Each structure stands twice: as C-alpha cells, then as structure tokens.
Design an enzyme around this catalytic site. Structure first.
Site, PDB file in Angstrom:
ATOM      1  N   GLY A  83      -5.700  74.993  70.611  1.00  9.59           N
ATOM      2  CA  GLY A  83      -5.825  74.330  71.892  1.00  9.59           C
ATOM      3  C   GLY A  83      -6.645  73.059  71.804  1.00  9.59           C
ATOM      4  O   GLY A  83      -6.187  71.990  72.207  1.00  9.59           O
ATOM      5  N   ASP A 120      15.959  77.380  92.829  1.00  5.85           N
ATOM      6  CA  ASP A 120      14.915  77.368  93.831  1.00  5.85           C
ATOM      7  C   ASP A 120      15.321  78.214  95.052  1.00  5.85           C
ATOM      8  O   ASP A 120      15.152  77.800  96.197  1.00  5.85           O
ATOM      9  CB  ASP A 120      14.626  75.921  94.234  1.00  5.85           C
ATOM     10  CG  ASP A 120      13.366  75.780  95.089  1.00  5.85           C
ATOM     11  OD1 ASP A 120      13.199  74.734  95.752  1.00  5.85           O
ATOM     12  OD2 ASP A 120      12.540  76.713  95.099  1.00  5.85           O
ATOM     13  N   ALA A 135       8.688  66.728  99.780  1.00  2.00           N
ATOM     14  CA  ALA A 135       9.570  65.799 100.481  1.00  2.00           C
ATOM     15  C   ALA A 135       9.188  65.509 101.927  1.00  2.00           C
ATOM     16  O   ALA A 135       9.153  66.402 102.769  1.00  2.00           O
ATOM     17  CB  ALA A 135      11.013  66.285 100.414  1.00  2.00           C
ATOM     18  N   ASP A 136       8.921  64.239 102.206  1.00  2.28           N
ATOM     19  CA  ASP A 136       8.813  63.756 103.574  1.00  2.28           C
ATOM     20  C   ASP A 136      10.202  63.686 104.211  1.00  2.28           C
ATOM     21  O   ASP A 136      11.089  63.020 103.688  1.00  2.28           O
ATOM     22  CB  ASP A 136       8.186  62.370 103.569  1.00  2.28           C
ATOM     23  CG  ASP A 136       7.756  61.923 104.945  1.00  2.28           C
ATOM     24  OD1 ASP A 136       8.180  62.563 105.928  1.00  2.28           O
ATOM     25  OD2 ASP A 136       6.992  60.934 105.044  1.00  2.28           O
ATOM     26  N   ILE A 137      10.404  64.376 105.327  1.00  6.00           N
ATOM     27  CA  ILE A 137      11.676  64.269 106.044  1.00  6.00           C
ATOM     28  C   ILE A 137      11.498  63.635 107.435  1.00  6.00           C
ATOM     29  O   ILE A 137      10.585  63.987 108.170  1.00  6.00           O
ATOM     30  CB  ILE A 137      12.455  65.633 106.130  1.00  6.00           C
ATOM     31  CG1 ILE A 137      12.249  66.320 107.477  1.00  6.00           C
ATOM     32  CG2 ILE A 137      12.133  66.557 104.960  1.00  6.00           C
ATOM     33  CD1 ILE A 137      13.297  65.938 108.505  1.00  6.00           C
TER      34      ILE A 137
END
Ligand SMILES: [Mg+2]
Length: 519
Positions: free
Chosen positions: A175, A436, A330-332
């Site tokens: 890591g 999704d 998402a802006d709608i």
C-alpha cells in the site's frame, strides 16, 4: 469499582489486537501486531498461526498495565472475517472468561470500527465508509439497525491494492509503495470504472491494472490511475449513500484510511456536499482491540449476555444481524411552454475527482443514457423520449413524466415491483445490462417508466445478468427492509413472465454471491 473495565480481543483478519477500556470511555491499553506472511510457496502459514503466537504476548503486556482481577468483562471479535482467525480469537477469549470467571461477549467487528469512531471523534451519527483488506462497505445506523447501503461485490479495496503490489513485486505491505509511486504519476491510464447502484467491484480494475503493467505502462502512472479510479468509485458510492440516508457527516474508517489521497478526495467530496468529515486516530482506525472492548461494554452495560455456546464465530456476520441496544449526480430542471413540457438533465462536475476522469464519467454516462433510453422502447419499455443532447455540456433534453418515484410508492403498492421485473426481464432478454437497478430510477404513473441508464452495457454474459439482479436485491434490502421479502418475490414474478432463462441466472446469483468468507 465505578468504571467497569473490559478486555477485548481483535482477530478477524491479519492484525492481532488487545484492548482494555472502561465504561467511562477511557482506553487504559491498546496494542496491535500484524501478521507478516511468509513466502506463498510450500511450508505455508496462516494468520491464525500468527494470532496463536501473538495473543498471549500481548495479553502479558496488558496484565502488566492493569490488574487482571480488575477486568470485569471480556469481549472478542465474533465476525465477520477469516474463520481460522475467528476461532483462535474465540478460543483465547473463552479461556479468559473461564479462568477469570467473568462474562464474555461476542461483538460485530464492523460496527465496532464505527463505535470507537463516535467515541474517539466528534462524529455522532455518521455515514461511514469502512475500507480494509477484507472489508469495504458503506454503513449507517437507520431504523434501529446498523445497515449496509453500499458494499463491494467481490474483493475489498485493500485486497485489490495488495494483489497488485504483489504482481508488480513490491514488498508487503505494498500500500505505502503504491501511494508513493502514484504521486510521481501523471498519465491517467485507461481502466474500467465500475460502480453498480451503491455497490462496487474491484476485480476488473485489478486485472486491467495488471494488463496495463504487462503492456509496459509506467508503474507510476498505473499506480496513480489505480488509486484515482478505486478512490473515486469509493467516493461516489459514499456520495450516493449520503444523499440516500440523509446524514450530515461522513466517517472514514479502516486500515486503508491511512492513504492520504483517499482521505483528501473524501474530504473534498464532503466539503462539496457541506457535510462533516471525521477519521479516528491511527490506533483506532485500523483493526484494534480497544474497539472490541468498547462495543463489548456498550452491549453488556445495556444488559446482554452470552453463554459459551452463543460465542460461536460468525464468519459472515452481517451488520443487520446485530440488535442495537445502546443508542446527487444530476441536476434536473423542468422547462414549460403553455402545454408542452421538457426536462434537461445535467451531470454536474465532481470537484473531488481528477478532471480527466470527471470529464469521461460525465460525457460517457450522458451519451450512454441518451442512447439507451432511446434503444429501449424497441423492447416495449416506457421511458422518456429523447429530444436532444448536448454532450459538451453533459446535458439531455427529454420528455417529462409526471408521477411519483418507485421508491416512494412501491411499499403501499407492491404491484409496481412486478413491473420493474418485467422491464428488467425484457432488458436481459435483449442483452442490455442496466447496472443501476434501484427504486429511485423508475417513475410510476399509469405504467412504470425507467429514467436512468447512465451505467448501461450490452452483454450476453450470465454473470452480468446475475450481478444485475444482485444489485437490485441488495438495494431493496437496504432501502425497503420493512417490505423486502415481498418486493423481491414479485420482482422475480415479473422477471419470470418475460425472460425464459430466468432460472439459469437466478441460480448463477448464488455462485456469485459466494464471494463471501469461507465457512
Ligand atoms: Mg477491521
């Protein structure tokens, strides 16, 4: 005798940890030692062997700091985790309870990570991303229970990195090396970004990283890319979980939390959404015994007991299974004429990710979505009509469906679980994977409408159809727990109506779901 003191054992994974804590939240003792794996050839060892050698060295130290006669409760990590490690931990914890003649309590390792988060940080009710070598899941306390809202579908991120480090011949733990090499990287190598619902998968990624190494990409670039992708994927599902559980703070937890980059990408995200971001101190962040002890106290202080026969290890201890007793992408926008209606959907930029990635994620999902919402009417599936698209700005002009979200009406009308199954069956009958499937992505009016398709993919593979169904399953289990059984049963009923191969992939689900802990 005022502060009741508890000794806890951690041993779910690769770290041997012993802790002493008092009901007053005081940590009197906390040391942990890690398994250092020998060559993976012949003459093998396992972490269990390490735990057996290490626990008593640690317990000696503990008893040198506090009087064993003073300890009132002993707790141990019951699960989840490696079976052979769980058993050594349990057998040592049982021996202590029997010779000290004190009660014993088996504790969920996962919700112990977060409880010392709350104890040790200014967090009080966080959405917590838990990452480590064997675990990666997004957890929040909702409806009287600690629940998973997002989790890996295959290997944990810590394990993704560990395998890569091994492949490229870095020493263990690798890591830190990948994190340093990544700082000197600059090209963002082509890799698969794989989020499904609120879950993720690291296997494809790991493999592509390997193939990129074989193809002669600069190690530094591969490392930078590995991290950007994996960490973005993890920041995304945490972002989605955040908008989904309506919490006001995020807590990062686990050995992987050590990675600065992951920490900073995660803080940007929280700053963007105006939420608080907490990380416990190193010693309570990775696997440790103190957290076992403190949670032990929490449950016993609130009155709960365990017979030695109830202290059986639970390798796949789910967070749901624990009785709690101690408590936008998402802006709608909608535009109207005096009778016509359109919506524009803009996939807005995410400041936390590398702008190059951000550009590909927003453009491709937008293009996919447009292309898919169109293609799917060919199958008899209601969707918005696609008017136009502006890929430069990441926008879509689509038709307006007036109705409530499936998530909001499905429980008081289970019939609509059937329709979801019909359109999924029609999807898989036609080789389209919708990665999704949730109840936030359908709108119900008279018929049922699908309204997201940003993660679509064409595929004839059954594994992909199977995973499709698990993501839906898992999402229903977390957000519609009150009515889960029934919605799935009817989802399968609808699926069955339409797709004749439903049985093959339903059974395939099982073999894929068994990417769990052995035994
Ligand atoms: Mg852990």
């Amino acid at each position: 005798m005022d502060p009741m003191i508890c000794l806890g054992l951690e041993g779910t994974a690769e770290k041997t940890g012993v802790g002493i804590v008092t009901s007053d939240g005081e940590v009197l003792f906390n040391k942990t030692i890690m398994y250092k794996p020998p060559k993976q050839g012949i003459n093998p060892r396992e972490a269990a062997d390490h735990h057996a050698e290490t626990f008593p060295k640690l317990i000696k130290e503990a008893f040198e700091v506090v009087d064993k006669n003073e300890i009132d409760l002993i707790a141990f990590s019951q699960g989840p985790g490696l079976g052979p490690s769980l058993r050594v931990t349990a057998t040592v914890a049982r021996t202590l309870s029997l010779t000290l003649k004190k009660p014993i309590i088996g504790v969920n390792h996962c919700i112990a990570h977060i409880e010392i988060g709350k104890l040790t940080t200014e967090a009080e009710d966080p959405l917590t991303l838990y990452v480590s070598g064997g675990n990666t899941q997004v957890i929040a306390y909702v409806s009287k229970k600690y629940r998973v809202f997002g989790e890996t579908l295959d290997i944990a991120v810590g394990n993704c990195l560990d395998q890569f480090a091994r492949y490229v011949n870095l020493p263990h733990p690798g890591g830190p090396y990948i994190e340093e090499l990544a700082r000197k990287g600059k090209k963002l190598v082509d890799l698969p970004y794989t989020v499904k619902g609120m879950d993720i998968a690291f296997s494809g990624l790991l493999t592509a990283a390997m193939r990129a190494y074989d193809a002669g990409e600069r190690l530094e670039d591969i490392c930078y890319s590995l991290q950007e992708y994996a960490f973005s994927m993890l920041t995304e599902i945490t972002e989605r979980a955040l908008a989904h559980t309506n919490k006001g703070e995020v807590m990062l937890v686990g050995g992987v939390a050590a990675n600065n980059r992951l920490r900073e990408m995660l803080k940007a995200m929280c700053e963007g959404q105006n939420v608080d971001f907490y990380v416990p101190p190193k010693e309570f962040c990775g696997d440790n015994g103190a957290m076992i002890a403190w949670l032990g106290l929490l449950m016993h202080k609130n009155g709960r007991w365990m017979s030695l026969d109830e202290t059986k290890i639970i390798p796949n201890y789910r967070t749901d299974m624990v009785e709690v007793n101690w408590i936008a992408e998402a802006d709608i926008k909608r535009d109207s004429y005096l009778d016509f209606d359109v919506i524009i959907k803009e996939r807005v930029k995410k400041g936390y990710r590398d702008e190059r990635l951000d550009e590909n994620i927003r453009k491709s999902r937008t293009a996919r979505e447009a292309r898919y919402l169109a293609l799917v009417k060919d199958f008899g599936i209601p969707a918005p009509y696609i008017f136009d698209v502006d890929l430069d700005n990441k926008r879509i002009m689509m038709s307006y469906i007036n109705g409530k979200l499936a998530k909001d009406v499905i429980e008081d009308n289970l019939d609509i679980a059937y329709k979801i199954g019909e359109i999924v069956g029609k999807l898989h009958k036609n080789d389209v994977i919708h990665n999704d499937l949730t109840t936030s992505n359908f709108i119900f009016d008279k018929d049922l409408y699908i309204i997201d398709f940003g993660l679509g993919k064409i595929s004839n593979l059954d594994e992909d159809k199977a995973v499709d169904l698990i993501v839906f399953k898992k999402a229903v289990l977390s957000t519609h727990h009150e009515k889960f059984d029934e919605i799935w049963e009817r989802f399968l009923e609808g699926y069955k109506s339409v797709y004749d191969r439903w049985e093959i992939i339903l059974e395939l689900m099982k073999d894929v779901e068994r990417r769990a802990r052995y035994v």
